[PDB]
């Protein structure tokens, strides 16, 4: 049987998100892409460096906002800029969110040598597409 990126069915008590409920054969039919850049276009270059940056960013933000991310990130590149768009929860205090936005935006700008901006969208609880 096929297993990649499939959430196995259960009794019906397991909540899943939209992206987590669709398998790889829906990536351009019912889903989009979580990262958007020009590396993988015909005749373009540096698709390997943009991928290592993505893998590190998804882990930096998972451990920098522990237990706060409601759904996967969305990385966006427009030339030199790097836009991180995240959906987070409302448990943490806003005082601490503003601290981490400025700490991460700055730390990552000096690491990757590019202007970095972070966009949060708070939701009360993790959105549920269906129950498996």
């Amino acid at each position: 049987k096929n297993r990649a990126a499939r959430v196995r069915v259960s009794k019906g008590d397991k909540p899943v998100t939209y992206e987590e409920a669709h398998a790889p054969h829906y990536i351009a039919h019912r889903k989009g892409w979580l990262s958007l850049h020009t590396g993988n276009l015909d005749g373009e270059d540096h698709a390997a460096e943009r991928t290592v940056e993505d893998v590190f960013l998804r882990k930096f933000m998972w451990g920098t906002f522990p237990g706060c991310l409601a759904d996967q990130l969305v990385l966006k590149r427009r030339g030199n800029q790097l836009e991180i768009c995240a959906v987070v929860l409302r448990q943490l205090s806003p005082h601490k969110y503003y601290f981490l936005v400025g700490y991460s935006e700055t730390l990552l700008s000096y690491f990757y040598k590019c202007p970095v901006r972070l966009h949060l969208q708070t939701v009360p609880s993790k959105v549920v597409y269906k129950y498996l």
Binding site: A5, P24, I27, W33, L34, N40, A48, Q72
Partner: protein
């Protein structure tokens, strides 16, 4: 903090081959011709063969940058077939989708 020693040995190899790249280049130019005397070409055959082994570029291996896998690596992303699919199947690679036709 690399994946394994096999990876660490290739990092060193890529570093030593970058230092002697020009020195090796200049010597081979003498050997790769029919113009200069054989006596001189014979001396350059011994000078480049006395260089350290790790300076030779053919001893470099394109491993995966995440798992250190020597085979099954896609050169454009520098990843193994197993890691590439893990990222492509989750929609983390821009433009990469499954083919059907």
């Amino acid at each position: 903090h690399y994946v394994d020693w096999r990876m660490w040995r290739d990092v060193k190899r890529r570093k030593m081959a970058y230092e002697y790249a020009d020195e090796r280049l200049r010597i081979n130019s003498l050997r790769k011709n029919t113009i200069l005397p054989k006596i001189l070409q014979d001396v350059a055959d011994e000078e480049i063969a006395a260089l350290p082994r790790d300076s030779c570029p053919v001893r470099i291996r394109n491993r995966c940058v995440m798992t250190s896998r020597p085979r099954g690596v896609k050169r454009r992303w520098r990843l193994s077939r197993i890691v590439f699919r893990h990222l492509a199947d989750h929609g983390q690679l821009s433009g990469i989708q499954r083919a059907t036709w």
